Symmetry: C2
Subunit: 149 residues, 2 copies
């Protein structure tokens, strides 16, 4: 009996792992723990549709990360800050500030989790910060810390 696996596969085979399972056992265990479903020509086409949309989405996303990477690499975030000791800052500029100045000045709302800053910026000057927009899309954000007051 052909079956559409809903869960127990390589994690969640819900994508559409269609395998011919033993009838009965299928409807006695798999079908019992919601693991699989009847490979009816409806729930087969209906599966195809979901896989087709998941594939479209994944592609929109990638395409978006790519356009977004282009917007970012033309910018320059400007974060002014109180410094003294040879350019050295009083506090530290971190991912939230950078994320905020980016929204405020460039109209971009980016999750601070994507701003791959390691150690918090603690000095006046320019810093190129990497931004992980997607598994295979990283952009360089130029950050500029200027002395205020």
């Amino acid at each position: 009996m052909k079956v559409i696996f809903l869960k127990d596969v390589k994690g969640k085979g819900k994508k559409g792992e269609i395998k011919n399972v033993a009838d009965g056992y299928a409807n006695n265990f798999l079908f019992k723990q919601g693991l699989a479903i009847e490979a009816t020509p409806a729930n087969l086409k209906a599966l195809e549709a979901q896989k087709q949309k998941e594939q479209r989405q994944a592609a929109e996303e990638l395409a978006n990360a790519k356009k977004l990477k282009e917007q970012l690499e033309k910018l320059t975030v400007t974060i002014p800050a109180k410094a003294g000791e040879g350019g050295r800052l009083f506090g530290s500029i971190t991912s939230k500030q950078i994320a905020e100045s980016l929204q405020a000045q460039h109209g971009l709302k980016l999750d601070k989790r994507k701003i791959e800053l390691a150690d918090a910026i603690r000095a006046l000057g320019y810093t190129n910060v990497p931004v992980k927009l997607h598994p295979e899309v990283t952009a360089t954000l130029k950050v500029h810390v200027t002395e205020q007051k």
Copy 2:
């Protein structure tokens, strides 16, 4: 008369811009300044071959930048340095040092031009530096500056 443009097009149409130019004029001016060539069925197939190889290459490159991006994001460059003044360095760690420590410790020979460091690192700690491996492939290099002596 069909002609294979060798130069004067959008920069260098040498890719294979095959256009039907007026016979005579072609062989009197274009053919004269090496701009175009006879669209013979040999120099047409021979063009196809070059376009086909240029397309293969461009793809190898991209594929390589992508694998290379994976190798880099697993590393951690360790550059020790003389510091004093509250972690502050005596000199500055720049792209050449980073490039060198990368070769020396990880067996990777990368052009320092790809290490998108802005202002030279002048303090002990960790710094994520962007690396432009290709027009659309950037990786994050984690750099670790440790106090020596």
